[PDB]
Design a protein around this ligand. Structure first.
Ligand SMILES: COc1ccccc1COc1cc(C2=NN(C3CCN(c4ncnc5ccsc45)CC3)C(=O)[C@@H]3CC=CC[C@@H]23)ccc1OC
Ligand SMILES: [Mg+2]
Ligand SMILES: [Zn+2]
Length: 329
């Protein structure tokens, strides 16, 4: 009735589950390549989501294992470790002091379930790739947010497997509300939505109201869902805000996937996509661009929304940015 020593060493890494910079690759190794299942399970227990939603524990485990097995272990970046990381980073962001007691338990379940499924069955290539190769996925979704639509359909469809219906005790009203929020969140992970999402977040910060304790006031679905969408998107774009040992691993993997899209981009129509060759395509300039044009304007605006809660994270982002700059010969 007691844990094995590996289970113990794993349990002890998991005590960092509430911290930015969790050793998520270590968790992956210690869990036998089950970071998504063990991190989701730990978050669900910690937030009391099993009791609140009357989720049987064997059904949660069965779903999570099934979900994690439909991430591709042969894809370097968009795999179950990235899913685990995004879940865990959303989890920390939800705990920010500026948002304390803002969100209902259903909203919290939506944001976490959304994070968990957000990239499921990702083939390791981009929307534009899928569209240009006339691939079945692009055809199925009439070229529109191809991957994101697929991630949602798979994550929901898997609930129909044997003892996988984790929402079986929710009311119909609960499930309709949850599904809509999940769909709205995951669809907002498509980078082509980034600019509009960022503009709405900037608008929100300008018109920012608060309550008594100084936590944000969000009194309509529009604003509530906007915050959750931008929160998961922050989590999705959180790699450069992590300590550098983590950040570099993520970079490696994103580059592997991307270079590998090249080897297939050589044959399949298409010239290549900018900054994606080691035949004229510096990794370090890419990272500096990524940070300057995408990650920093987002995280800076997030940081204003929840001021001062995100300072450390924004500091790290700025350090990492200097580090990559100073490596450009
Ligand atoms: C330009 O940035 C990169 C180019 C190639 C490889 C890697 C990066 C940045 O590193 C990471 C990217 C991602 C994600 N990338 N993208 C898109 C971001 C925008 N983008 C660009 N293409 C060309 N030039 C520029 C200049 C600034 S951005 C950019 C295309 C790729 C995704 O769509 C991913 C899917 C959703 C969220 C994360 C995305 C992730 C991590 C990276 O390094 C850790
Ligand atoms: Mg995605
Ligand atoms: Zn992702």
């Amino acid at each position: 009735g007691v844990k094995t020593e590996q289970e113990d060493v794993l349990a002890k890494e998991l005590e960092d589950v509430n911290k930015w910079g969790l050793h998520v690759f270590r968790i992956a190794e210690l869990s036998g390549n089950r970071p998504l299942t063990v991190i989701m399970h730990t978050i669900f227990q910690e937030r009391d989501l099993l009791k609140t939603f009357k989720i049987p524990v064997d059904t949660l485990i069965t779903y999570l294992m099934t979900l994690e097995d439909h991430y591709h272990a042969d894809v370097a970046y968009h795999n179950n470790i990235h899913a685990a990381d995004v879940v865990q980073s959303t989890h920390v962001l939800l705990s920010t002091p500026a948002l304390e007691a803002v969100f209902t338990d259903l909203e919290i379940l939506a944001a976490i379930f959304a994070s968990a499924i957000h990239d499921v069955d990702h083939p390791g290539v981009s929307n534009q790739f899928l569209i240009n190769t006339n691939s079945e996925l692009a055809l199925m979704y009439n070229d529109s947010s191809v991957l994101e639509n697929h991630h949602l359909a798979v994550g929901f469809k898997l609930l129909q497997e044997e003892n996988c219906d984790i929402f079986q005790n929710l009311t119909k009203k609960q499930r309709q509300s949850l599904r809509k929020m999940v769909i709205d969140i995951v669809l907002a992970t498509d980078m082509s939505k980034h600019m509009n999402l960022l503009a709405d977040l900037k608008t929100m910060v300008e018109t920012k109201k608060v309550t008594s304790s100084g936590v944000l006031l969000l009194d309509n679905y529009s604003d509530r869902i906007q915050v959750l969408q931008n929160m998961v998107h922050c989590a999705d774009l959180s790699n450069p805000t992590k300590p550098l040992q983590l950040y570099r691993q993520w970079t490696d993997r994103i580059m592997e996937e991307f270079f590998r899209q090249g080897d297939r981009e050589r044959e399949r129509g298409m010239e290549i996509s900018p900054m994606c060759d080691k035949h004229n395509a510096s990794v370090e300039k890419s990272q500096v661009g990524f940070i300057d044009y995408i990650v920093h304007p987002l995280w800076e605006t997030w940081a204003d929304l929840v001021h001062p809660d995100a300072q450390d994270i924004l500091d790290t982002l700025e350090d990492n940015r200097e580090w990559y700059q100073s490596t450009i010969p």
